[PDB]
Structure formats: C-alpha cells, structure tokens
mmCIF file with all atom_site columns, C-alpha atoms in Angstrom:
data_model
loop_
_atom_site.group_PDB
_atom_site.id
_atom_site.type_symbol
_atom_site.label_atom_id
_atom_site.label_alt_id
_atom_site.label_comp_id
_atom_site.label_asym_id
_atom_site.label_entity_id
_atom_site.label_seq_id
_atom_site.pdbx_PDB_ins_code
_atom_site.Cartn_x
_atom_site.Cartn_y
_atom_site.Cartn_z
_atom_site.occupancy
_atom_site.B_iso_or_equiv
_atom_site.pdbx_formal_charge
_atom_site.auth_seq_id
_atom_site.auth_comp_id
_atom_site.auth_asym_id
_atom_site.auth_atom_id
_atom_site.pdbx_PDB_model_num
ATOM 1   C CA . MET A 1 1  ? 0.000   0.000   0.000  1.00 48.02 ? 480  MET A CA 1
ATOM 2   C CA . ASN A 1 2  ? 1.420   3.345   -1.111 1.00 45.38 ? 481  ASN A CA 1
ATOM 3   C CA . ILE A 1 3  ? 0.233   6.845   -2.030 1.00 43.90 ? 482  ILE A CA 1
ATOM 4   C CA . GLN A 1 4  ? 1.603   9.811   -3.975 1.00 45.65 ? 483  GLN A CA 1
ATOM 5   C CA . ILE A 1 5  ? 2.588   12.723  -1.733 1.00 46.26 ? 484  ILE A CA 1
ATOM 6   C CA . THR A 1 6  ? 3.901   16.005  -3.142 1.00 47.37 ? 485  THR A CA 1
ATOM 7   C CA . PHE A 1 7  ? 6.057   17.586  -0.440 1.00 47.50 ? 486  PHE A CA 1
ATOM 8   C CA . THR A 1 8  ? 6.894   21.267  -0.215 1.00 42.83 ? 487  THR A CA 1
ATOM 9   C CA . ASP A 1 9  ? 9.505   23.472  1.433  1.00 38.70 ? 488  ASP A CA 1
ATOM 10  C CA . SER A 1 10 ? 7.006   24.618  4.073  1.00 41.09 ? 489  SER A CA 1
ATOM 11  C CA . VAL A 1 11 ? 8.056   23.222  7.436  1.00 37.93 ? 490  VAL A CA 1
ATOM 12  C CA . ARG A 1 12 ? 6.455   24.412  10.666 1.00 38.23 ? 491  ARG A CA 1
ATOM 13  C CA . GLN A 1 13 ? 8.893   24.158  13.572 1.00 36.89 ? 492  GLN A CA 1
ATOM 14  C CA . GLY A 1 14 ? 8.190   24.996  17.218 1.00 38.41 ? 493  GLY A CA 1
ATOM 15  C CA . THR A 1 15 ? 7.654   23.794  20.785 1.00 39.08 ? 494  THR A CA 1
ATOM 16  C CA . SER A 1 16 ? 4.496   22.163  22.133 1.00 37.23 ? 495  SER A CA 1
ATOM 17  C CA . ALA A 1 17 ? 2.617   23.084  25.304 1.00 33.27 ? 496  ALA A CA 1
ATOM 18  C CA . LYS A 1 18 ? 4.638   20.304  26.964 1.00 34.41 ? 497  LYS A CA 1
ATOM 19  C CA . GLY A 1 19 ? 7.866   22.090  25.988 1.00 30.93 ? 498  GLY A CA 1
ATOM 20  C CA . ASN A 1 20 ? 8.572   19.289  23.491 1.00 30.70 ? 499  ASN A CA 1
ATOM 21  C CA . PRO A 1 21 ? 9.994   20.148  20.029 1.00 32.37 ? 500  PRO A CA 1
ATOM 22  C CA . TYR A 1 22 ? 8.042   19.292  16.881 1.00 32.39 ? 501  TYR A CA 1
ATOM 23  C CA . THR A 1 23 ? 8.764   19.456  13.160 1.00 34.58 ? 502  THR A CA 1
ATOM 24  C CA . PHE A 1 24 ? 5.712   19.647  10.930 1.00 36.38 ? 503  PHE A CA 1
ATOM 25  C CA . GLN A 1 25 ? 6.317   19.645  7.185  1.00 38.40 ? 504  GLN A CA 1
ATOM 26  C CA . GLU A 1 26 ? 3.821   20.551  4.469  1.00 39.22 ? 505  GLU A CA 1
ATOM 27  C CA . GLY A 1 27 ? 2.857   18.187  1.682  1.00 41.56 ? 506  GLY A CA 1
ATOM 28  C CA . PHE A 1 28 ? 0.065   17.572  -0.824 1.00 40.75 ? 507  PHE A CA 1
ATOM 29  C CA . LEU A 1 29 ? -1.865  14.291  -0.803 1.00 39.92 ? 508  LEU A CA 1
ATOM 30  C CA . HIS A 1 30 ? -3.221  12.497  -3.869 1.00 40.26 ? 509  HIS A CA 1
ATOM 31  C CA . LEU A 1 31 ? -6.328  10.332  -3.515 1.00 41.22 ? 510  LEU A CA 1
ATOM 32  C CA . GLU A 1 32 ? -7.796  8.053   -6.193 1.00 40.64 ? 511  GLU A CA 1
ATOM 33  C CA . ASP A 1 33 ? -11.234 9.278   -5.141 1.00 39.20 ? 512  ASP A CA 1
ATOM 34  C CA . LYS A 1 34 ? -10.255 12.958  -5.358 1.00 40.36 ? 513  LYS A CA 1
ATOM 35  C CA . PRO A 1 35 ? -9.616  15.002  -8.558 1.00 41.12 ? 514  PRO A CA 1
ATOM 36  C CA . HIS A 1 36 ? -7.499  17.602  -6.765 1.00 41.65 ? 515  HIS A CA 1
ATOM 37  C CA . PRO A 1 37 ? -4.718  17.079  -4.175 1.00 43.27 ? 516  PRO A CA 1
ATOM 38  C CA . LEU A 1 38 ? -5.180  18.045  -0.519 1.00 45.08 ? 517  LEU A CA 1
ATOM 39  C CA . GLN A 1 39 ? -2.767  20.160  1.521  1.00 45.95 ? 518  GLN A CA 1
ATOM 40  C CA . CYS A 1 40 ? -1.608  18.154  4.540  1.00 46.38 ? 519  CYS A CA 1
ATOM 41  C CA . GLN A 1 41 ? 1.102   18.421  7.194  1.00 50.76 ? 520  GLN A CA 1
ATOM 42  C CA . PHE A 1 42 ? 3.359   15.633  8.437  1.00 51.98 ? 521  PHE A CA 1
ATOM 43  C CA . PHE A 1 43 ? 5.232   15.086  11.704 1.00 52.87 ? 522  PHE A CA 1
ATOM 44  C CA . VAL A 1 44 ? 8.604   14.297  10.149 1.00 52.81 ? 523  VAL A CA 1
ATOM 45  C CA . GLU A 1 45 ? 11.894  13.748  11.969 1.00 51.78 ? 524  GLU A CA 1
ATOM 46  C CA . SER A 1 46 ? 14.047  15.074  9.139  1.00 53.89 ? 525  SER A CA 1
ATOM 47  C CA . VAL A 1 47 ? 13.231  17.681  6.485  1.00 53.87 ? 526  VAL A CA 1
ATOM 48  C CA . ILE A 1 48 ? 12.189  16.070  3.195  1.00 52.94 ? 527  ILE A CA 1
ATOM 49  C CA . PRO A 1 49 ? 13.106  17.782  -0.128 1.00 51.28 ? 528  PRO A CA 1
ATOM 50  C CA . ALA A 1 50 ? 10.111  19.164  -2.025 1.00 53.65 ? 529  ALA A CA 1
ATOM 51  C CA . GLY A 1 51 ? 8.966   16.664  -4.659 1.00 54.87 ? 530  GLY A CA 1
ATOM 52  C CA . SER A 1 52 ? 6.350   14.001  -5.425 1.00 53.42 ? 531  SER A CA 1
ATOM 53  C CA . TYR A 1 53 ? 6.949   10.640  -3.752 1.00 51.33 ? 532  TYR A CA 1
ATOM 54  C CA . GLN A 1 54 ? 5.241   7.249   -3.689 1.00 52.17 ? 533  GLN A CA 1
ATOM 55  C CA . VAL A 1 55 ? 5.272   6.554   0.028  1.00 51.38 ? 534  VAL A CA 1
ATOM 56  C CA . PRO A 1 56 ? 4.528   3.013   1.341  1.00 57.09 ? 535  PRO A CA 1
ATOM 57  C CA . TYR A 1 57 ? 2.129   3.405   4.263  1.00 56.41 ? 536  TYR A CA 1
ATOM 58  C CA . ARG A 1 58 ? 0.524   1.049   6.762  1.00 56.03 ? 537  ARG A CA 1
ATOM 59  C CA . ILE A 1 59 ? -2.328  1.248   9.271  1.00 55.28 ? 538  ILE A CA 1
ATOM 60  C CA . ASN A 1 60 ? -0.920  1.322   12.808 1.00 53.41 ? 539  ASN A CA 1
ATOM 61  C CA . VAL A 1 61 ? -2.951  1.309   16.005 1.00 50.62 ? 540  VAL A CA 1
ATOM 62  C CA . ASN A 1 62 ? -1.902  3.767   18.708 1.00 52.52 ? 541  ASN A CA 1
ATOM 63  C CA . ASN A 1 63 ? -3.594  4.024   22.109 1.00 51.26 ? 542  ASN A CA 1
ATOM 64  C CA . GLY A 1 64 ? -6.389  1.933   20.535 1.00 55.68 ? 543  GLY A CA 1
ATOM 65  C CA . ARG A 1 65 ? -6.932  4.239   17.551 1.00 56.11 ? 544  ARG A CA 1
ATOM 66  C CA . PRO A 1 66 ? -6.228  3.276   13.889 1.00 55.05 ? 545  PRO A CA 1
ATOM 67  C CA . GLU A 1 67 ? -3.713  5.673   12.301 1.00 57.25 ? 546  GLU A CA 1
ATOM 68  C CA . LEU A 1 68 ? -1.518  5.845   9.202  1.00 57.03 ? 547  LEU A CA 1
ATOM 69  C CA . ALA A 1 69 ? 2.204   5.093   9.377  1.00 59.11 ? 548  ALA A CA 1
ATOM 70  C CA . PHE A 1 70 ? 4.203   6.390   6.418  1.00 56.49 ? 549  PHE A CA 1
ATOM 71  C CA . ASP A 1 71 ? 7.485   4.652   5.636  1.00 54.29 ? 550  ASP A CA 1
ATOM 72  C CA . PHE A 1 72 ? 9.710   7.478   4.380  1.00 58.11 ? 551  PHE A CA 1
ATOM 73  C CA . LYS A 1 73 ? 12.570  4.962   4.267  1.00 57.44 ? 552  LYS A CA 1
ATOM 74  C CA . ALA A 1 74 ? 10.990  3.123   1.326  1.00 60.86 ? 553  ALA A CA 1
ATOM 75  C CA . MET A 1 75 ? 9.299   6.011   -0.483 1.00 59.42 ? 554  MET A CA 1
ATOM 76  C CA . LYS A 1 76 ? 9.997   6.280   -4.191 1.00 56.44 ? 555  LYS A CA 1
ATOM 77  C CA . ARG A 1 77 ? 10.461  9.650   -5.897 1.00 55.95 ? 556  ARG A CA 1
ATOM 78  C CA . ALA A 1 78 ? 7.699   10.146  -8.459 1.00 58.08 ? 557  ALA A CA 1
ATOM 79  C CA . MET B 1 1  ? -8.693  -0.175  -0.551 1.00 62.68 ? 1349 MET B CA 1
ATOM 80  C CA . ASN B 1 2  ? -10.240 -2.311  2.183  1.00 64.47 ? 1350 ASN B CA 1
ATOM 81  C CA . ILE B 1 3  ? -9.233  -4.115  5.382  1.00 64.63 ? 1351 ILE B CA 1
ATOM 82  C CA . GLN B 1 4  ? -10.617 -6.934  7.526  1.00 63.24 ? 1352 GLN B CA 1
ATOM 83  C CA . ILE B 1 5  ? -12.041 -5.714  10.837 1.00 62.86 ? 1353 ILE B CA 1
ATOM 84  C CA . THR B 1 6  ? -13.447 -8.108  13.438 1.00 61.46 ? 1354 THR B CA 1
ATOM 85  C CA . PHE B 1 7  ? -15.977 -6.152  15.491 1.00 62.22 ? 1355 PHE B CA 1
ATOM 86  C CA . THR B 1 8  ? -17.107 -7.067  18.982 1.00 64.20 ? 1356 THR B CA 1
ATOM 87  C CA . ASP B 1 9  ? -20.030 -6.332  21.288 1.00 60.72 ? 1357 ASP B CA 1
ATOM 88  C CA . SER B 1 10 ? -17.901 -3.958  23.378 1.00 62.31 ? 1358 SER B CA 1
ATOM 89  C CA . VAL B 1 11 ? -19.178 -0.424  22.889 1.00 60.79 ? 1359 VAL B CA 1
ATOM 90  C CA . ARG B 1 12 ? -18.006 2.433   25.098 1.00 57.86 ? 1360 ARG B CA 1
ATOM 91  C CA . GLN B 1 13 ? -20.699 5.096   25.429 1.00 57.19 ? 1361 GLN B CA 1
ATOM 92  C CA . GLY B 1 14 ? -20.434 8.384   27.329 1.00 57.87 ? 1362 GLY B CA 1
ATOM 93  C CA . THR B 1 15 ? -20.170 12.176  27.242 1.00 58.32 ? 1363 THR B CA 1
ATOM 94  C CA . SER B 1 16 ? -17.053 14.172  26.385 1.00 58.13 ? 1364 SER B CA 1
ATOM 95  C CA . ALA B 1 17 ? -15.577 17.072  28.349 1.00 57.50 ? 1365 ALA B CA 1
ATOM 96  C CA . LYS B 1 18 ? -17.541 19.310  25.962 1.00 56.65 ? 1366 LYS B CA 1
ATOM 97  C CA . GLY B 1 19 ? -20.780 17.620  27.064 1.00 57.35 ? 1367 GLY B CA 1
ATOM 98  C CA . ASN B 1 20 ? -21.018 15.996  23.615 1.00 60.76 ? 1368 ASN B CA 1
ATOM 99  C CA . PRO B 1 21 ? -22.143 12.337  23.315 1.00 63.13 ? 1369 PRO B CA 1
ATOM 100 C CA . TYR B 1 22 ? -19.823 9.730   21.808 1.00 62.42 ? 1370 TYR B CA 1
ATOM 101 C CA . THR B 1 23 ? -20.178 6.077   20.840 1.00 58.90 ? 1371 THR B CA 1
ATOM 102 C CA . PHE B 1 24 ? -16.939 4.123   20.701 1.00 56.87 ? 1372 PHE B CA 1
ATOM 103 C CA . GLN B 1 25 ? -17.160 0.506   19.580 1.00 57.33 ? 1373 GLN B CA 1
ATOM 104 C CA . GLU B 1 26 ? -14.478 -2.160  19.930 1.00 60.54 ? 1374 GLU B CA 1
ATOM 105 C CA . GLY B 1 27 ? -13.063 -4.062  16.986 1.00 61.17 ? 1375 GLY B CA 1
ATOM 106 C CA . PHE B 1 28 ? -9.993  -6.064  15.974 1.00 59.72 ? 1376 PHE B CA 1
ATOM 107 C CA . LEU B 1 29 ? -7.835  -4.946  13.044 1.00 58.25 ? 1377 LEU B CA 1
ATOM 108 C CA . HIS B 1 30 ? -6.046  -7.250  10.606 1.00 57.00 ? 1378 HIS B CA 1
ATOM 109 C CA . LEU B 1 31 ? -2.837  -6.051  8.952  1.00 62.08 ? 1379 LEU B CA 1
ATOM 110 C CA . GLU B 1 32 ? -0.937  -7.833  6.171  1.00 62.83 ? 1380 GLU B CA 1
ATOM 111 C CA . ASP B 1 33 ? 2.275   -6.928  7.985  1.00 62.78 ? 1381 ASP B CA 1
ATOM 112 C CA . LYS B 1 34 ? 1.048   -8.275  11.336 1.00 60.71 ? 1382 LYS B CA 1
ATOM 113 C CA . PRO B 1 35 ? 0.584   -11.968 12.318 1.00 61.20 ? 1383 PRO B CA 1
ATOM 114 C CA . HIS B 1 36 ? -1.893  -11.172 15.090 1.00 59.55 ? 1384 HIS B CA 1
ATOM 115 C CA . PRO B 1 37 ? -4.873  -8.758  15.041 1.00 58.32 ? 1385 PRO B CA 1
ATOM 116 C CA . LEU B 1 38 ? -4.856  -5.516  17.041 1.00 58.48 ? 1386 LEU B CA 1
ATOM 117 C CA . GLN B 1 39 ? -7.616  -4.364  19.391 1.00 59.70 ? 1387 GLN B CA 1
ATOM 118 C CA . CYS B 1 40 ? -8.920  -0.991  18.210 1.00 59.84 ? 1388 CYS B CA 1
ATOM 119 C CA . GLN B 1 41 ? -11.897 1.260   18.942 1.00 60.08 ? 1389 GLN B CA 1
ATOM 120 C CA . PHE B 1 42 ? -14.050 3.086   16.405 1.00 55.74 ? 1390 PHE B CA 1
ATOM 121 C CA . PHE B 1 43 ? -16.198 6.222   16.617 1.00 56.86 ? 1391 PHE B CA 1
ATOM 122 C CA . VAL B 1 44 ? -19.326 4.714   15.085 1.00 56.57 ? 1392 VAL B CA 1
ATOM 123 C CA . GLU B 1 45 ? -22.733 6.362   14.742 1.00 55.45 ? 1393 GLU B CA 1
ATOM 124 C CA . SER B 1 46 ? -24.682 3.116   14.992 1.00 52.05 ? 1394 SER B CA 1
ATOM 125 C CA . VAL B 1 47 ? -23.801 -0.111  16.812 1.00 50.86 ? 1395 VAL B CA 1
ATOM 126 C CA . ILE B 1 48 ? -22.314 -2.704  14.451 1.00 53.30 ? 1396 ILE B CA 1
ATOM 127 C CA . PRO B 1 49 ? -23.017 -6.440  15.055 1.00 55.34 ? 1397 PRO B CA 1
ATOM 128 C CA . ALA B 1 50 ? -19.958 -8.426  16.140 1.00 53.99 ? 1398 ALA B CA 1
ATOM 129 C CA . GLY B 1 51 ? -18.368 -10.128 13.129 1.00 57.70 ? 1399 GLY B CA 1
ATOM 130 C CA . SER B 1 52 ? -15.495 -9.890  10.636 1.00 59.45 ? 1400 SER B CA 1
ATOM 131 C CA . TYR B 1 53 ? -16.006 -7.364  7.839  1.00 54.54 ? 1401 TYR B CA 1
ATOM 132 C CA . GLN B 1 54 ? -14.069 -6.192  4.791  1.00 55.70 ? 1402 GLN B CA 1
ATOM 133 C CA . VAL B 1 55 ? -14.417 -2.447  5.177  1.00 54.74 ? 1403 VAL B CA 1
ATOM 134 C CA . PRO B 1 56 ? -13.550 -0.108  2.247  1.00 53.30 ? 1404 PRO B CA 1
ATOM 135 C CA . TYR B 1 57 ? -11.492 2.745   3.687  1.00 53.79 ? 1405 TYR B CA 1
ATOM 136 C CA . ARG B 1 58 ? -9.974  5.933   2.306  1.00 54.32 ? 1406 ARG B CA 1
ATOM 137 C CA . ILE B 1 59 ? -7.413  8.484   3.491  1.00 56.81 ? 1407 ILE B CA 1
ATOM 138 C CA . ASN B 1 60 ? -9.172  11.732  4.417  1.00 58.11 ? 1408 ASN B CA 1
ATOM 139 C CA . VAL B 1 61 ? -7.479  14.937  5.513  1.00 60.29 ? 1409 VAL B CA 1
ATOM 140 C CA . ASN B 1 62 ? -8.978  16.723  8.515  1.00 62.71 ? 1410 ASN B CA 1
ATOM 141 C CA . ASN B 1 63 ? -7.662  20.020  9.888  1.00 65.27 ? 1411 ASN B CA 1
ATOM 142 C CA . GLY B 1 64 ? -4.573  19.334  7.733  1.00 61.89 ? 1412 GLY B CA 1
ATOM 143 C CA . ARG B 1 65 ? -3.907  15.859  9.146  1.00 60.84 ? 1413 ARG B CA 1
ATOM 144 C CA . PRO B 1 66 ? -4.162  12.593  7.123  1.00 60.84 ? 1414 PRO B CA 1
ATOM 145 C CA . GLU B 1 67 ? -6.676  10.194  8.708  1.00 62.16 ? 1415 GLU B CA 1
ATOM 146 C CA . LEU B 1 68 ? -8.555  7.024   7.776  1.00 62.71 ? 1416 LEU B CA 1
ATOM 147 C CA . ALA B 1 69 ? -12.208 7.130   6.732  1.00 63.44 ? 1417 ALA B CA 1
ATOM 148 C CA . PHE B 1 70 ? -13.988 3.780   6.934  1.00 67.09 ? 1418 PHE B CA 1
ATOM 149 C CA . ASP B 1 71 ? -17.036 3.292   4.721  1.00 66.79 ? 1419 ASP B CA 1
ATOM 150 C CA . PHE B 1 72 ? -19.329 1.105   6.837  1.00 64.08 ? 1420 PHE B CA 1
ATOM 151 C CA . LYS B 1 73 ? -21.965 1.508   4.117  1.00 64.60 ? 1421 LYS B CA 1
ATOM 152 C CA . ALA B 1 74 ? -19.958 -0.649  1.697  1.00 63.86 ? 1422 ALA B CA 1
ATOM 153 C CA . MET B 1 75 ? -18.313 -3.074  4.118  1.00 64.96 ? 1423 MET B CA 1
ATOM 154 C CA . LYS B 1 76 ? -18.641 -6.744  3.267  1.00 66.30 ? 1424 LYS B CA 1
ATOM 155 C CA . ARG B 1 77 ? -19.197 -9.390  5.944  1.00 66.81 ? 1425 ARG B CA 1
ATOM 156 C CA . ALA B 1 78 ? -16.232 -11.773 5.972  1.00 67.37 ? 1426 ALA B CA 1
#
C-alpha cells in the first residue's frame, strides 16, 4: 500500500505546550477518489526535499486508535 | 482499498468534556504486515453487530492531518 505525496519546502517548527519540540512539514496528498490534491502536514523527523513521492504506508494502532504510518525509508520519488 | 475488521459487542458510550455524546465501539484490526490482530476502537454512529467485515477505507485529511475514513456503508461481511 502506497500513495503519492507532493512535499513542499514549508516546514512548521516549534515547541508544544509540553515544551517538546516538533517538526511539521507541508505536503500535498493524492487520492484516487479525489480530482485535486489536498494540503496536509506531516510530523517528520528530518526535512524532506520538495517533490512528489510514492510513500509506502501502513495502518498502525496507537492508544487503541487506527492511524496511518508512512514509511519514508521506502518512499519512491515520483 | 479495504481491510478486515473483526468487530465485537464492546461499545463504550459516554459524554465528552464538551458535554457531547460519543459512541466508541471495539473491533480487531487485521494487517498484512502483522501476524496477530490488534484491538482498536471506532467512533461509530450506529452499533455494528460483532463479526469480521471487509471495510472499504480511504485516506481523508482533517484540519490538515491525514486520517482514515472507513465506509461502513460498503463493508462486506467476511
């Protein structure tokens, strides 16, 4: 399972209410059921260079809630 | 895109801090990359009868965050 994600050079950096550091990066999402891409932000560890990628994702369950886990280690530049 | 979800008769009902009502139902998730199923809860509108289903999901973006949207209207009993 993978999806095309067009990243940008827009990265929101800052500290959370808990004093913890976070790095949110912007990126556009492409859905087979959507004609236009959606602007989304990702909680990346390292800044990703702007460009379209085919990221292999999986459905992980955290604290009992189903969430998406994107594998940036196996993403393919589109 | 679909995934096997084994629902149960465990539904957590209650009010949120905002006084709003919520209906959380239990269900087991099946991942191709996992040998055993994971216990997960869903924010359903109506109680679903315990049983394994093949639910067609999609990746929706809310408030700029990528999340899963399960289509219980097109799920197939497994």
